[PDB]
C-alpha cells in the first residue's frame, strides 16, 4: 500500500487566504508582494489539479467561516484538502484584517471525524505568516489528528524575509519546485528541497540595522500516515 | 546531491536518556516499560551503525551537561547525530529526575553556531514523553534551524500510551520499521510508516473511564534540507 489513494474525480479543494491590507486597529502594515505570491501559488496549485479559490483581506470571522463551511462540504470524491494562508502571524496565530485568529481554530473544523468525508485523507496547510517577531542572523502543531501536514514559511519564533517586489523566498521555492516535480516526487521531498532552496542560497537581510542578515528556514510538521504523490 | 552525504569515518553518536524513576516531589511516577524501550532502541540504533550511549535516571542538570559536552565534541568525521529522550513530558518541556527542563534548551546546544562541527549534518531528536493524569469533559517548541528533525511519540497535547510490559508503541514501531528497512528507506518514509503503525491502535483497552481507549498520533517536525539515508 504505502501511499494515499489518489483515485478520485478531483484532487480536492485549495483555499488561498491572501491577507494584504489590514485595519488601523491591528497596527500591521501592507504585505506587498503577497499578490505575486498568491498568483504564483494559484497557478502552481491549479496546475497540480486543485480547485483553487482565492479570498483577499479576510477578517478573522471569514477565515473562520471560510474553513468551517469547507469542512462541511462533501469530499467523498476528493483525494485530499489544502489550505494556504498568507498573512502576518505570531505564535500559533495568524492575522485577520480586523485582528488575530489561532491557527488551531482554523484546522479544528477538519480535526478527526468532525469532517468524516475527509477522514484518512491528507489535509495540507501551507502557512506563510511572515514577521513572527524576533529574527535570526546567519552562520557559515495543531491538529492533534493524523493525516494533517503543515509547512510554515517562517518558524515558531523567527522572521522570514522576502522582497516587496519579487515576493517570498518560500513561495518562489515552493512554486518553482512544484512547477517541475509536483507530479513525480513525494510531498516530503518537495518540501525538503524547498527547505534547502530557502536555506541555501538565499540569506535573509534588511535595509534596517535591526533586521540586517537573519537566516530563516521553513518548517514541516507531518502527521501523515502514507506517502503523498499528486499524480493520481 | 539531493541527499545527505553519508561518507564519513562513522555514522555518528546516539545519546539515549532513559528516565524511569523520578523524585517524589515531582509527583511523577515510575515509568514501567521504559527499560524495554531503551534496550530495543539501543540495539536498533547500534545495528544502524551509531555509537550508542545510555544514560539512566538523569537530573535536569545532568541532561543539560551531557548534551552540552556532546555538542562540544569534534563530530568532523561523523555523518550525523541522534538523541533519544525517554521521560515524562509536558508542553515543550521534559522531565529530569528532579524537575523540568525545556526541550529547546537541550537541543539548542547543537545549533550550527554553537556546534560548527555538525553544520549541514542531520541532527536527529526522537522524543517519547508523556504527562500524567487528569481528564477532560465534552460539551454537547524547539531549535528552528537547518538540518534538525524531531519525532514526538504523541502530538504535544495527548499521551503516548506505552505499556509496562512491552514498551511504548512508538518505540516498538520505530525499532520494528528500522530493523527491517532502516538501511533502504529515507527517514520521512520510516517515520511516516511509524505514524501509520501507532495509528493502527485498535483500542488501548485500559481500565479507568478516563484512560479507556482514546487516541495518540506521533508527529514529525522536519527542518532537513536533504534526503537522509543511513547508507552509502
Amino acid at each position: 500500500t504505502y501511499q494515499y489513494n489518489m483515485n478520485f474525480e478531483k484532487l480536492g479543494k485549495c483555499i488561498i487566504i491572501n491577507n494584504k491590507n489590514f485595519d488601523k486597529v491591528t497596527g500591521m502594515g501592507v504585505r506587498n508582494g503577497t499578490d505575486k505570491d498568491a498568483e504564483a501559488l494559484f497557478k502552481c496549485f491549479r496546475s497540480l489539479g486543485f480547485d483553487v479559490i482565492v479570498y483577499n483581506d479576510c477578517s478573522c470571522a471569514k477565515m473562520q467561516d471560510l474553513l468551517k463551511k469547507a469542512s462541511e462540504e462533501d469530499h467523498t470524491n476528493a483525494a485530499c484538502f489544502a489550505c494556504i494562508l498568507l498573512s502576518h502571524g505570531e505564535e500559533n496565530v495568524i492575522y485577520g484584517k480586523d485582528g488575530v485568529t489561532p491557527i488551531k481554530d482554523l484546522t479544528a473544523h477538519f480535526r478527526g471525524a468532525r469532517c468524516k468525508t475527509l477522514l484518512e485523507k491528507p489535509k495540507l496547510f501551507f502557512i506563510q505568516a511572515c514577521r513572527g517577531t524576533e529574527l535570526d542572523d546567519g552562520i557559515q502543531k495543531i491538529p492533534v489528528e493524523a493525516d494533517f501536514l503543515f509547512a510554515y514559511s517562517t518558524v515558531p519564533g523567527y522572521y522570514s524575509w522576502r522582497s516587496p517586489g519579487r515576493g517570498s523566498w518560500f513561495v518562489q521555492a515552493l512554486c518553482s519546485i512544484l512547477e517541475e516535480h509536483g507530479k513525480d516526487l513525494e510531498i516530503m521531498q518537495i518540501l525538503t528541497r524547498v527547505n534547502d532552496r530557502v536555506a541555501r542560497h538565499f540569506e535573509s537581510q534588511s535595509d534596517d540595522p535591526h533586521f540586517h542578515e537573519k537566516k530563516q528556514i521553513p518548517c514541516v510538521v507531518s502527521m501523515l500516515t502514507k506517502e503523498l504523490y499528486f499524480s493520481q
Side-chain angles (χ1 to χ4, degrees), chain A:
Chain A
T1 299
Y2 309 124
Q3 288 154 50
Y4 281 106
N5 160 43
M6 300 304 263
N7 248 304
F8 297 82
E9 302 198 62
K10 25 185 184 176
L11 214 190
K13 187 166 207 164
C14 183
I15 293 180
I16 299 184
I17 294 175
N18 173 189
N19 295 345
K20 181 179 177 188
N21 308 294
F22 305 71
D23 301 327
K24 181 97 65 175
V25 177
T26 64
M28 306 303 293
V30 168
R31 309 176 58 269
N32 305 305
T34 184
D35 279 345
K36 309 300 199 60
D37 293 340
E39 176 170 355
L41 283 174
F42 183 85
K43 182 186 185 311
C44 168
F45 276 65
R46 177 47 222 148
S47 89
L48 264 174
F50 285 101
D51 297 324
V52 198
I53 298 175
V54 182
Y55 309 82
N56 309 84
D57 299 317
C58 303
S59 65
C60 297
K62 197 186 300 70
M63 297 187 289
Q64 272 305 313
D65 182 48
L66 221 43
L67 274 92
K68 195 198 72 178
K69 296 180 165 181
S71 67
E72 270 152 24
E73 277 179 44
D74 172 36
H75 310 281
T76 304
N77 294 306
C80 67
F81 173 77
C83 178
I84 294 182
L85 306 170
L86 310 184
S87 180
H88 284 303
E90 309 185 312
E91 268 62 54
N92 343 299
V93 59
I94 23 72
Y95 263 81
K97 67 173 301 190
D98 65 347
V100 102
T101 303
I103 291 167
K104 54 243 71 288
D105 282 347
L106 306 173
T107 63
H109 307 287
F110 305 77
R111 209 81 69 79
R114 183 175 160 181
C115 181
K116 288 165 186 165
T117 130
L118 270 179
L119 208 106
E120 305 252 320
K121 297 185 184 167
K123 266 134 299 187
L124 295 10
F125 291 81
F126 302 73
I127 311 165
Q128 156 91 72
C130 69
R131 197 171 186 181
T133 306
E134 184 179 62
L135 319 74
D136 193 60
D137 194 300
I139 191 64
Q140 183 182 57
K141 194 93 294 306
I142 148 49
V144 243
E145 261 304 313
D147 306 295
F148 272 83
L149 178 144
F150 303 73
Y152 294 89
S153 182
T154 289
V155 109
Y158 272 175
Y159 186 125
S160 66
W161 258 87
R162 71 169 75 75
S163 46
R166 215 203 207 81
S168 170
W169 284 339
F170 179 63
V171 176
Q172 296 179 200
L174 177 50
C175 292
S176 172
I177 301 173
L178 282 172
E179 212 72 61
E180 161 161 345
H181 285 290
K183 297 167 177 177
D184 53 294
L185 296 183
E186 196 287 307
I187 190 58
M188 284 310 278
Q189 298 189 279
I190 298 295
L191 298 177
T192 298
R193 294 184 181 206
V194 175
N195 284 347
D196 177 45
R197 192 78 84 76
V198 170
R200 81 188 160 175
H201 216 64
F202 303 150
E203 156 197 287
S204 183
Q205 191 179 301
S206 187
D207 188 297
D208 201 291
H210 300 300
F211 311 114
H212 178 67
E213 295 294 0
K214 308 282 200 170
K215 279 323 302 167
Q216 293 327 319
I217 187 79
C219 174
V220 188
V221 179
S222 166
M223 269 73 86
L224 298 191
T225 44
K226 308 285 189 194
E227 303 205 36
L228 180 70
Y229 282 102
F230 290 116
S231 45
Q232 300 176 293

